[PDB]
Structures are given as C-alpha cells and as structure tokens.
Symmetry: D2
Subunit: 499 residues, 4 copies
Amino acid sequence: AGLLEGVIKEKGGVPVYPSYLAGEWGGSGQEIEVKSPIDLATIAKVISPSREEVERTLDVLFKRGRWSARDMPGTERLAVLRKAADIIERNLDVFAEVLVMNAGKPKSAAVGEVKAAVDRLRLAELDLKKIGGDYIPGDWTYDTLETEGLVRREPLGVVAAITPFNYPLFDAVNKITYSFIYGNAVVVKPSISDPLPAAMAVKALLDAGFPPDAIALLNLPGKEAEKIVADDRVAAVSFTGSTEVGERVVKVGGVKQYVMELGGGDPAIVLEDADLDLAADKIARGIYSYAGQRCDAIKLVLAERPVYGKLVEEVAKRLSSLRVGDPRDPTVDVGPLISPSAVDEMMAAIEDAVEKGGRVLAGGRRLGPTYVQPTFVEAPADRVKDMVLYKREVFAPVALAVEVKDLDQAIELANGRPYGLDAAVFGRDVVKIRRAVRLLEVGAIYINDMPRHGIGYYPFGGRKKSGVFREGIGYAVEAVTAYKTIVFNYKGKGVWKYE
Amino acid sequence: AGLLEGVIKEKGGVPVYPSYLAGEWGGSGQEIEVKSPIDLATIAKVISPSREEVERTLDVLFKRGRWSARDMPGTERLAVLRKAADIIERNLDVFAEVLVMNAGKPKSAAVGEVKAAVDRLRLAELDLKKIGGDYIPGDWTYDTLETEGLVRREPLGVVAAITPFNYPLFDAVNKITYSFIYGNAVVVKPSISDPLPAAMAVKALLDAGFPPDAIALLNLPGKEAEKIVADDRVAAVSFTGSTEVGERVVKVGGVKQYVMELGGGDPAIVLEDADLDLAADKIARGIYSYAGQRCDAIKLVLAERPVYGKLVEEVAKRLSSLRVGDPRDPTVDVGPLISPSAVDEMMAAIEDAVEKGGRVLAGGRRLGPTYVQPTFVEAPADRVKDMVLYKREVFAPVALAVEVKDLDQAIELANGRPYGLDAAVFGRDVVKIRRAVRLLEVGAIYINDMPRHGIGYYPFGGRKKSGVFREGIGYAVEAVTAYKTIVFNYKGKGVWKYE
Amino acid sequence: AGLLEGVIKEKGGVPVYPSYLAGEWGGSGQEIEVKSPIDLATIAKVISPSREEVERTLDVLFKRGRWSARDMPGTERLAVLRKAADIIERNLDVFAEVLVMNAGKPKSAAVGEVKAAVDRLRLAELDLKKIGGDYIPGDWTYDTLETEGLVRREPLGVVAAITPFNYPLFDAVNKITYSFIYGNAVVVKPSISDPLPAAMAVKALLDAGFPPDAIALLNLPGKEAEKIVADDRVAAVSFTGSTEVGERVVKVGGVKQYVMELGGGDPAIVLEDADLDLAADKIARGIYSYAGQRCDAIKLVLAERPVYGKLVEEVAKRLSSLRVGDPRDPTVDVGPLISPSAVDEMMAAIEDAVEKGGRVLAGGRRLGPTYVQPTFVEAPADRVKDMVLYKREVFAPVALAVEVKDLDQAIELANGRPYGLDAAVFGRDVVKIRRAVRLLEVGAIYINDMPRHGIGYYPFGGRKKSGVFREGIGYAVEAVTAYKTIVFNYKGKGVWKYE
Amino acid sequence: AGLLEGVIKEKGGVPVYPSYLAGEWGGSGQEIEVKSPIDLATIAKVISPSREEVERTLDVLFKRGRWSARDMPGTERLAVLRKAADIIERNLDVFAEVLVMNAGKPKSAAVGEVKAAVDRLRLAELDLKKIGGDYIPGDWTYDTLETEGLVRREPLGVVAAITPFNYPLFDAVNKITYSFIYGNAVVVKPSISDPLPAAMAVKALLDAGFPPDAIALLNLPGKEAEKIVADDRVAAVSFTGSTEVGERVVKVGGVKQYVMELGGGDPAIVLEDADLDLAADKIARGIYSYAGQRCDAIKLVLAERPVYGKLVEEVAKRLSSLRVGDPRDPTVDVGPLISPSAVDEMMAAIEDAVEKGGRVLAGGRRLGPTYVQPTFVEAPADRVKDMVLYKREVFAPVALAVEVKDLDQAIELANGRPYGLDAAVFGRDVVKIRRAVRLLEVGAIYINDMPRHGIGYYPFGGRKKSGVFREGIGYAVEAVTAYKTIVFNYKGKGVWKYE
Ligand SMILES: NC(=O)c1ccc[n+]([C@@H]2O[C@H](COP(=O)([O-])OP(=O)(O)OC[C@H]3O[C@@H](n4cnc5c(N)ncnc54)[C@H](OP(=O)(O)O)[C@@H]3O)[C@@H](O)[C@H]2O)c1
Ligand code: NA
Ligand code: NA
Ligand code: NA
Ligand code: NA
C-alpha cells in the first residue's frame, strides 16, 4: 500500500502480493492465502514462484546479483541502507499495521519492531568494526622466514535468508543488512504464514537503490524452499527457526556456511540477593511478550528458596493483571498466537505439567481458537524434568517456576533442557554470577535483565539444540563472509637480511 | 614400537594396533589389515571398536572428557603439547619410518611431516593470539544505554577429527592441537588406510599427560564413522577429505560446527614478468610432491603467451629428471600412490585428456600397480574445460598446462574448476597481482611460491567445492569454539549519569 | 557571519572575533589583528583571553567539561557531530570564503577542506572500530590461574588541541572530533595567524549541541599557549606543527599523552617501471598544492636513471603551466604563501641550492611579498645532502629533483633527510616496492599516488623529526584515551576447578 | 660470579662490575660504590662509562644495534630469550643472593623476582598476540575508493630502559624483553643504587646470544643519564621511577615515544560485603611486601563503617606479628629500606600524621638506620587529606586507614591523592564494583585482591601523577613500536569496477 502501489494486485477483493524475482515482481506459481491470527480471516494472498522462476531467480542472483552487490562500493551500500531506513521510518504506521494484522503483534510491539528494523539499517556503519583484515609477519617460524601474509574477508556470494514468523520484519531486514553490507546478494524466504512485512521491506530497499538483481523474495511454503537451500549457487544459509527445520535445512544443504538460530526457550535464575521488583517485572515481561512467541522468551524460572515465594508471587500478579484480546487495541497487553494449533499444544503442555505434579499459578484459560492467558506453572524440581514444558519449547506465553536450594541446582536445572540460547541471572554477588556465567551452556547470559536480542548490538545465538554461530552487529560477518589468505614469498629477494 | 611397546599386540606375526577408547587401548570389533603402497603387503592390523565401544567411548568423552580437557588450565595444556612434541621428536626415525612404510611417503617428506607435527605442537602458544574476548560498551545506542557486553570464546565440547590418508600424522596432530588447546575433548578417526601414525601420536600425547578420558582414537572404516558424526554429543566436526565424503558428513551430522577442508587441486598462474626459474622449480615441485597426493598440489598451470614455452619446457625437464620407485631409498624423489585404483584413475584421466586434444609433455608411463611417472599434459584452452583432469581432482602427480592470452583468461580458466582451495601466481606487477588476488575464488593465494599449507602459520581452507571455514594457527579457534555473550544491565543503577 | 551573528563584534569597521571560554564567547586580553596573505590587509581581530580567563577556562573544562563530555552518551555525541556536519555543510560557501581569504587557499582547496571537515564529522561512526576493550582469560600462567582481566579505554579528560595555519579548519575539526567522540573535553588553540575558521567550526559545534562547558577556543599567540600545555589539568596534547615548536611543547608539558604530527616534507621515488604520466601528475600536484604549504608536500623527487629525464621533464612542464595569483579567482592554481617571510626563506633556499650545484628546472621567480612560482630544483646526488632544501623543510612550493642509480640509493637519499612523515613510491614491481616499504623510515608510504592524509581514513604520523604517534579514524583513540585494566580474583572461589 | 667470571674485576677486595658498552664490558669513568641496605657496607663497585664511551655506545646501538636486533628474525629472538631464561634459572640462587644483599629483599621475594624474570623471558611468545597489523579496505569512503591500506608495527630503534631500585632484576628484564622481542636495540640504565642484578641479567642475555652490539648497560648516576635520554638516537624511553624524575626525563628528552610508570601508592577499598579475612590478609601483605618499596603497595585503606573495625583490627594484628631484621634469614618477613633517608622520611610522615589527628594502630618504631616496623596509621576523613602520608608517596611500609560512610566517599577519598596507578576493591556486589571501576581514576583496579603487577600478564600503568602509557605482555608493544601505514592506489587500474 503506497510503498507497494504498483506491486500489489487487488484480485477478487484480496490484495495479492507477488514474489520479487531479482529484477521484477511476479510469480506464476500457486497463490497462497495469508491469514490473520486476530480473526483467522484471509487478509491477502502471495504468489509463489514456479520451479522455473526459482531456478531463473537463482541464476540471476548468482550470475549478476553477486557482482551488483559486490561491485557497489560499501559507501554506496551504506547509503542504500540508510535510505531504506528513511523510507520505512516514514511508512512506520503502515509497517506496524501490517505487523499487528498479519502477525497479531500488539501495536507497541509492532512499532518497536519497525523501529528495530530502521535502527538496524542505520547502524550498518557499526558492522564495519569487524571488517578489516589481518597482516601476519612471517619471521616467527623458520619455515616462513622472508614470507608474509594478509588475511581478508570476502563475501560468499548468494546468502539464503530463511526467516521465522515471530519477527517477520526485523529478521528479514537484519539478515539482508548484514548479508548486503559485506557485498552479498540475498534470497529472502519468509514464513509463508506472514510474508507481507518482508515484501514491504524489500520494496523499501529496492526504492532505496538496492541493486535490483541482487535481492529476491520468494513466497515458498516450507519444503518448497529446500530447492533453494540445496542449490550450489547458495553459498550460505542464515536460518532462524525451529531446531527440527534447522536440522532438515543442513541435511538438505550439505557443506555450506551456516548460521542457525534455533531458539528454544530461556531459563531465568534468581539468586537470593536479587532485586525482586526488577526480577519479577523483567521475568513477567520475558514470559508474555508477543504471547511468548519470542525465541528469547522465559520458559523456566529458577529461584533460590529465600526469594522463591515473593518472586513467584509477584510474577503471578503481573501475569494475571494483563489484558488479552485483539492487538489493534493499544489497550491489550497480549494479542493472539499465530495459529489455533499453537494454543492446542500449549493447553496440552499445561495438562501434562499438571498431571506430573505441576500447579498453575496464573492463567491456564484458553480464550478462543488463537487466544490464551499468559500461564505460569509451578513444578517441583524432582518432577519438572519430565514435563513437556521443560523438555520442549512450547511457543506460547507459558513458563514453569521451580524452587531450588542453591546456585548449583539452578544451574543444573537450567542446563537440563536440550536448548542453550540465552539464560538470565538476577543477583548481585560477583562470584555466584561468574560461576553461573561459566557453567550455563548458552550463547548469551543476561545479568539483571530479561533476555532481549534487540537489534543484535550484542551478538547472540545458540548452544546445544539452539543452533550454531552468532548474529549481531559486526559478528554476523563470520556467517556471510569467507576469509581469503594471500601469502607473499620474498625468500632470497633481499627485502629482509635473515629475518 | 617402543612408544607403543605395551599397546601393540603381535598376533600371528603382524603387529595389531588397537583403538584408544578414551581411557584404555582395546577394541573388540572386526580386525582390519593395513597395507603398504610400497608392496601391497599387510604391515599391521588395527582393531576397530564395536558399536558398544563406540557408544561407550562417546559417553566418556562427553561426560568426562569435556571436563578433563576444560578443567586442565591452558598453561598445563601447553605443557602437555610441548612434552608430546619432545616425545615425537626423540622418536622421529620411528615416526618417519611408519610414514614411509604406511603411506609410501618419501623419506624426506616423512621426516618433514614429523617435524611439522612437532612444530605445530610447540607453537600452540601462538594459537593464543586469537583467544581473548571483546568488551562492548553499551552507550552507542539508546536502547543499550547503561548496558555493557562481554563476548568470550568457550570450547564446544567434543570435536570429531576425521583425517585423510595423505597426511596421517600431521592432520591428526593439528586437529588435536587446536581442538585441545582451547579446552575440547577429541575423537580422532584416521583413514583406515594408514591409521598407524595417529595411534603413535595419540600415544605420545597420552604419555605427555593428555587427559586420558579426553581423547579417543577409533579405527573405523568409512561409513562406520557416520555413527560418530551423527551423534549429538559431537559438537563439532573437523573434516579434511574429499568433497563427496564431506557432503555426506554434513548430511549425516546436521546442525553442528564444521570445518570442511575438501581439497581439489590448485591452479598456478604465470605472468609474463615472472621469474621463470623460480616458477618452474616451484610448479614442478607443486605437481609431484608426495606423488601429487597433496590437497594443495598444482593440477593446472596457466601461463601467458610470452613465457608459456620456456615455463612448460622447464617444468617438463624437471618432472622428467625425477627418480621414481620405493620411498625407503633416500634416492627416490617419488614413491607410490596409496592404491592401484588411484593410478588407474590417473591413467584414465590422461587418456581422456589426450582424446580431447591433450598432449603429454612429460611422464605418462605407469610403472606398476602403485607406481607412475609425474605427468604433465598440455591442453588447448578451448578444450581443457571438458577434460577430466580439469573438471575433477585426479589425486596423483598430474597437471595440465594451458597457454593463455592474458591475466583475465588465466583467471577465468583458474576459476573454471569446481574447486577453490588455493591458487598460485608468479609475477611481479602489483596491479596484475592485486587483480588476481581479488578475482581468484580461493581460500588462499600464494604469490611467487607454490601452494604449501605447512603447519598453518597462515590460515587456509576452501571456497566452492573445496569446503568451508579455515584451519590455521589462531584461526582454527573459530571451528572448535563457540562465543558466549554476557550482557550486564546497570539501567538506573547509578554507574553512569545518562551515558 | 550568520553562524556567528551574535558572536562577532564590528568594532571600528573590522569584525572582532572573541575567544570561546567554555561557556561564553568573550575575552578581555589584548586584541590581535588577523591578516590575509592575499593583500597583507587586516580582515579581522581576535580577542585573546587574559591569564585570569585562561585559568578560569581550564578550571571549567577540568571540573565540568570532562564530565559533560563523558556523561553525554556516545550515541548523543555522534548526533552532535552529525548536526555540526550539517551546519557546516549548509554554510559551506561562508566557510570556504574565510579559508580563501584568511589562509590564501585557492577556492577549490578551501572547498575541499570544508568538505573534509564535514566528512570527518559524519564518519565519527567509523572511529568506533577501535573502541571495544579486551578480555584476558587468566589460566595461561600459573600465577594468574582463577584470575581474569578486562582492559578498557577511558577518556583522559582535557585534551589540548594545538593547530597549524595550513589547515585551520580541518585540523581543528579533526582533533575535536576524535577527542570528543571518546568522551574528552577540548581546548582548541588555533594558529593566531588564521584563527577564524576554528571560531566558525566551534560555533557550528556549539549550535549542534556540543556540551558548552566541554570546549574552549583560545586565541593565544605562540608562547602564550605554553600556559595551557604546562597545566596539569591538561592530560593530553594533540599538536600538529613544526618540529621546533613540538619540542618546546613537550619540554613545557612534561609527562603527558602526546600526538606530535611535526611534518617536514616528503620524498617521492620513481622506479623505472612507473607509469610516468601518473607519477609526473601526482608529483607536480604534490609539490604545488596550497603553495606547498602541506606537511605532506613533496620536497624531494628521486628517480632511477632510465625515467629521470622524462619524469623531471613532465613535472617541469606541469609546474610551469600553473596560474599563480589571487585565490579568489577560481582560475588560479596557486595562491599566496602565508607570509612574506615564508617566501624570503624559499628564495634563500633556492639560492643556496644553486650555489651548491643546483639548477632550477621550473619557477624561481618571486611575484610579490607573498607570491612565488612553484619551483623545481635539480641537484646532483653528491651535493644535494648539504642543500638547505634537503636538510630542512622549506614550507613553500619547492622540491629538489635527484637522479639515482637504483632503489638502494633512492632509499638512502630518501632516508637522509631528518624527517620521516610520508614517502611516495611509483612503480609496479612487488619486490622493489616491498623493499622500499621496509626500508623507508616514515610513518606512511603511498604506493602509486602522492602523499595525501585526507581525513585520516588511513592513519598517519611521523618518524624521526616528524614526530610521534598517529592520527586517523580509529587510531587517534590511542592519543586521547588511557587504558583501564580491571583484574578479577576468583582464586579458591569455585568458579574454575584447577583451570 | 660464575656467570660473570671473566667480567668482574676484584680490585682491592671489592668486586668491580664494569658497564657493558654494546660490544665489550668496560668503562673508564669514575668508579662508584654499591652498598647493601642490610649493613650499609660496600659490597661492590660499578664502573661508570666516560662521556666518550656513552657517546660511542649510543653510536654503536644506533648504527649497528638497531639492525642486529631487527635483522635477527623473531624466531631467533625468542630462542635467545628462552636461553637467557634457562641461564638465569640455573643460576637462581646466585641471582637471588645478590637481590637479598644488594636490595635488602627478603629471600622469598628475591626468589620470586628471579622467577618473575625467568617467566617473563619464557612468555615472550605471548607478546605476539599484539604483533599483527591491520588491513583497511578503501571503499567505505568515496575519496578512498579503489585504494587500500596496510597498517604495520615497526620497531623504533634504540629504546632507553631506565629502571628503579625496587625491582632491579625484573624491570630490567621486562623492558629488555618487550623492547627486544619487537626488534629494538636497548640501553639499560639501572639505579646506581643496586645495578648488580641488571649486569647479571645482561650477561645471561649475552651468553644466550643476544646481539652483542644491540644492548648496553650503563652505570650512570642520576643526571648523568640525561645525556642518554636527550639524545636523538634514542627513539623511546621506558621509564619506571618517581614522578619527579619522570618529569625531568620528558623535559630533557622532548618529543619521543614514552612509557612512564611513575608509581605513587595505591588505595584499597573495602565494601561492607567483603570477605574480611581475604581483605585483611591481602591488604596487610599489600602494605608490607618488600618493606612497602613497591609502586603497587597499599598506602591508604578505606573501609565502610560496618566492617572498618574488624578489618583495621585484623590488618593491625597481621602487621604486628611480622618479623623484621636481616633478609638473609628466611625467618624474616621484612628486610631493610634501601637507605636511612627513606626511613627518616617515613618517621617524619608518621609524626605529621599524628600531629594532624592521626593514630598509629601498628608499628611506628624505627629499629635502626635502615630498619622500621610496618606502620598502620588511622586517620579521620576530615583531616587525612592534608597528611603527608596521603598527599605524597612515602616509599616505606606505611599506610593510612580511614573509615568512610559509603562507596562515594571511599571513591572520592581514593581519587583525592595525586596518583592513579592501581586501586583495590574488596566486595561482592556487581553494581557497587562496577561504579568503583568506572569512577576510580587509576590505570588498574584489582577486585578482591591486592594490587600486584606480577610479570604484566595484565597491563598496568598510571593515570594522573602515576604517569602515562602501559606495560604488559602484548601491550608494551605500543611503547617501543611505531606504526607504518602503506596506502596502495589502484584508481582506474581495473582491480575493482566502481567499488
Ligand atoms: N582441503 C584441505 O586442506 C585438504 C588437505 C588434505 C587432503 N584433502 C583432500 O582429501 C582427500 C584426501 O584423501 P582421502 O582419499 O583419504 O579422501 P577421503 O576418503 O574423502 O577421506 C575421508 C576421511 O573420512 C572418512 N570417511 C569416509 N567415508 C566416511 C563417511 N561416510 N562418514 C564419515 N567418515 C568417512 C575416511 O575414512 P576411510 O579411510 O575409512 O575411508 C577418511 O578418514 C583428497 O581429495 C584431498 O584433496 C584436502
Ligand atoms: Na550441497
Ligand atoms: Na544432527
Ligand atoms: Na607537566
Ligand atoms: Na629531544
């Protein structure tokens, strides 16, 4: 709309969003309905590309896109990204509305995501802190005497950005930004569930000057994307999604550069010396934000005996005083879950917990096909480990609360889930904190705050089932870039005199 | 022998080498014969572990090895590696003999490899140049104000080191070194073809004090190793081998940290201003060393019109004046190829070349089941691209020679193979060299020298089919280590006053 | 004017520019006339501060400025600098006019300097590439086991920026930028010769939001500034000027953090394989730009026998075809020298050269008190070393030309001057270039281009008499920042288990 | 002795140690007596060099030493340093004895210093972590498009190492190590008070293979050394000593690279949540070690109301139960102070404290010309600031104890001394610690441990009157090295296609 005026086709009353085929918007594959979790109604349709168009798109990205991206100097790439930030920023309300509608994201969250996307774009300048190369003098070994080395980063070529439904706008902009800033072409494949924000972002980027043949947006459902991942013209795959799909992706892709942000939930530990007001507030928010549909959502709360009571009490109060419903109301604190299935699973997971000795301390009530109350289930340490809510990631606003004797048990229980994305620790004692930081097997630990990846100012990523590699300003360079070593031989050439 | 006095079992006149099961040498799986390429005779047997022992070994590595390695401070780890270097160095002749016998490596090459292994071990101190972490101040964004970050490296746990036959000693020592120096446990799986050097190295390491439950040596043939790669207790897989196996490995392994050094050959470019004496000498050596059974061997020579003649002439002379035969003779320049099959393929590849317009300029004569002459086949640019020797990696002492008009054609032809490991460029003009460095799609470019990874003083690794990620002193940290981000929240705590 | 509407006082027909006293513009010290080199006419007056005001200003900078600068978060500091860039950019013509008038800078050079200042301000974001700190794990030594270190950069406090006359605008903006971006307060002391551009820049910065008590502009003549340098509240002194004053500054300042950019000229070497069109063009420009009043101006040209003739011929032609005169004419290539004295010295230096066997190849004619022709004096290698033009820096558009047998003699002669700022080398052979790069004792070597510090995209600074330390985007952090090491002791605390 | 068998001359019953003149041991200047603080008796004599020999030595260091050091490859330099470590280690008892005798250092401290020197030498390998250079791509600005930069470190040439009396062995070995590892020649000028350990170290280095013309040991008293510092052949001055001499050194030296470690004492802060056993123990030791003749000695103890009593009580007990006397007795905890003057000043400083309201809590008794008891003087916050013990550095085992209300007052009082070397903070709360770390104006803060520079595993150095720049493994490179920037111009050369 406006930004997409010439792109969208209103066929039979429903806006039809086409795929961007590295040059022209189009697509002659099956059309797919995009629905809102707010009312299960179809709000648009996306045109998937045919196998022939996928193939043609990859060919363009590979034969020309790599070069258009690479041959645009960084100073210009930065201008493109800054311009795109401006376009998105002036179309903020439009971007947010689509997030609220297409993702069921509360207005404030949708606005925050648009702003995150804008900031990410504007701070592409900070990604340069990890851009320089290394100069290795060769006289520190006899075999390399009169020799010298230069190690540089080079873009890999075509990066496939596969994105999840819970951050349809930001994830796509983030991956495109760090992939492009370093000189790569990019194939974005958004969740077929809410692909509208990506289409809007890609349009803003194209309007900003992004090399037209260096980007592609393909509306392909699940396994249709395998064809992209398995293709040799795709040198890297930046994937943010579930562990299970991530696994399938690597198995389909084979040898290639990967960044796998596979989520799972996050445990939060509260030491006896923690500021419980701060802790309860951050933990409650960590549990419910975007209806827990955040990879960094809190799924397990571990608190030492002496503060467990108050802490769990406060979090319960906070979760209970939340307003659920339609996200269009800036009154609502919690909108719907992406699908009735996600709610089904959450309900089943809560029953499992209750059956295994668990007790609901807040929530528990399903309010409709896609609506539920943020639930907080207490569980005894000796039984929690077998609970579905512990063993798995229930993508919903639901967390377990478990009282623990001391730090070692908290740590042990925190490390007992199969995931290792982030962990939170509230407390003040440097020694206990240092111990926790050392022993928690996670990509990131947040001291005195809820886990929040934000725009990646600080790098993040998983351990164990949560994946491999990191995303972040500067650090993402490792996933979309390859080193290039140049060794110079001056043996006997008179540069050095035996040294 | 001596180092392995209590380990090896002389059963029926043939030394029987057992697997090391992270604690004790043993194995109750099938026994497998190890033969010498020098005479196709069985020189020993290795005991493969049973499925039960593989499983038990992994369990030990995971439950205890990770901790024994990690909980040994770096200063002690360095002492272990230095001690191991001493043990290997005093047993040099024994190490070299086994290389000559088991791998068919010429005496000087076998001695050089033992020395490379010793140096690698002693320079583990240089790997620390990439060990420190990053401190990220948070006041460069509003959302992160009064926040701070620490980014650190942490060992992944259990690294599976899969090694090729062409550098049985060094590769195993290299992977063990960089995996261990950072605190990881390691499962070494050597080529079942020549696993004796690894067994000797692992023994020297164990004698040096390497945590007995933090290392394992498993004599498993090909697909028997899949069980290790596919296991979740294996957090990283450092693989050096062929593209095809590398592909299978990732597909079996799924999401995990990988370093894939997949070889392929290397092209060498000679500019009109090159010192042709240096070039011919380095190129000849690059073609024949260890009977071309080097991932960094020269497989294609591209020379500009004006020097093509002399260059190809000189390389031909040099290859022709080489002494082939048994590697025990310090007289021999070239020993045998690892198997009669490898020679078969080389012969077939030479015929293919000849049929497509190629002309042998040196060699071409097979001298026995496992012996051949270093061959240099000239080919016209317009036909070389379809030749098996160009399209594939023929692991043998054989290279193609192709005359080219200019740098652009040399570069184009060099980039036309499916591999991108290293490339060599002989010439003096900075501009032409810089252009070549920019356009050659390889992990490493050697200016005025033949490609030689050495001990990894300079990082190396592939592009395209040659794999992903790099190995090298300092740089290998990226493959066996994961980042850990710790974010500290001091918002409103009075550390800063709005800043 | 406009930007300075409320600041400047028109007393007796001459605009009177007051000093900025870290809070308010003013000054009750002697008034000093500012003249134009274009016509020796007084174009303005500057009010110097009294001893009491200097003292009061320092007190404010120290007691409040350090904190205003430091307590403004970086994100805001960046906004200030970007805003200042905008203000200067919209007032470009006004900034340039003052440069042309006050410095005698040709219009295109004055415009280029304003743009350099604007870019420097906008790229302050790139200075962050060197901002993070280091995390040092402690288990690599026994004495530091269970210990850990964090190394961070911290602003020093009050940086005294002393600037030269030849880049009155840029130098002041550069020093203020890198000093401020890291959290320092700044006392700018411009050349009393052309202090108007600094006053304008400081006003733009104040209008942009620069903490009013964190900056000071003091119009003090020469030794009046010693009082600032010698003060203990001044933690660092960023000085760009002559060797002799630089020496006096350190001797007055004593222990303190220093960056001393002390110029001197630069030698240029032309190898036999150099593109002589490029060389002659760049060298000619390097000799005459801003009437040679550039620290990086070419003062000596060394060319190998085979190209000496053509090279010197071409440079002579180019210097001869230059238009001298008043800088207001966009027709003029060369304006006047800052003072009649500077011309006197140049004439004397040319006579000295001629007397010692030197021969003028272009120029030599003085055209007025402050006007002269760009002069190129040929000199025999065996006599040049004793020539004033070689031994000293004659700040004027004058260079010596000396034929040399080979690289070694060029290098020897290039290193024979007492300075070591930059050096230029035109040629293509990597070996000769590498040798030159190794042996030239200078802070920076420019391959195939004239020396040009630009905005410091690449760090620069001197060796020998040219000073110490470097300025540059990112690198200047070392001069206005101090490290802060935090060592954490966890011995026996149970974080690690013997490691 | 033994190591110095052919060097030392027994003239008139007293061993006569000559200076090392970059080639030969000798000296024809005045002879100077070296006395022991243990009994004021002359234990040896040192021959100072004549003005002619100083001049000749500098000439050798400059004309040949720079090259011998630089032209010895790093791999060999490392071998020299490792060999020297071996020589010193096998002569440990001899090295320690001279420390005990010449410096009055307790046996355990003397042994610890020899070991520190040995370790420093062996870990020279860790200094390489800061040796590589930077590669700066040029397409991030329009003016630098098609341009590229390489930034490298280069040795400065001749480094003058001026050392203090309190660590005669280590300081000399440290400065020589970091100066030499990077390729510099070195003039060591030890305290004329105890120059014997330096002579022994220099001999071990020469025996180890240290280029004979790249090192010099000059026995010059105080201002005789100015001649070295003021010389232009001296590119850097690494000085560890008092603020006042440091000031004189820079004023004599002028523009040059400096590292000024100017000591002063260190304050220690004890928060209410500190482990007081650890604190009292570390603080007591920090106060008395080597009779407080440590730049990092604790001179001021600040403790919050609630723990002040116990803390000061415990430290008093510990200081009181110390055994003073002759250092030869391994029984003694505290030997003598370097001179009767140092004791005089300490006594006067204690009286001043008492007169201003201070009360001795331990010690106070002078036991002889050079012996005293470790003294702990309590002082009220409102009067301490004017006490000599606070305002100055009394180089003796004496510290002030001051009770404080909270962290802010502790910090304020800690920052009130004119020095800023290190500071110690005992406590557990992360927020209070972070605040302290931010506000303490010192080069280094030690959390939960006494300040101990050790061998510089962690970098250290001063703020304010404590000097400028840092020493440390890796970090010292900045003081004895200069950057060298090489900019390559490929504009229009076809390397890049507009990028
Ligand atoms: N890129 C580099 O830096 C580099 C360096 C050296 C060599 N190379 C390349 O690697 C090859 C070396 O020779 P190679 O013949 O030994 O090649 P390879 O067969 O690919 O070596 C494979 C290694 O993987 C094991 N393996 C085989 N199938 C496996 C499977 N299905 N699952 C798990 N592991 C399996 C092999 O054991 P078995 O021996 O039991 O089959 C062997 O240890 C050449 O192509 C060379 O160019 C590359
Ligand atoms: Na694949
Ligand atoms: Na897997
Ligand atoms: Na001073
Ligand atoms: Na001087």
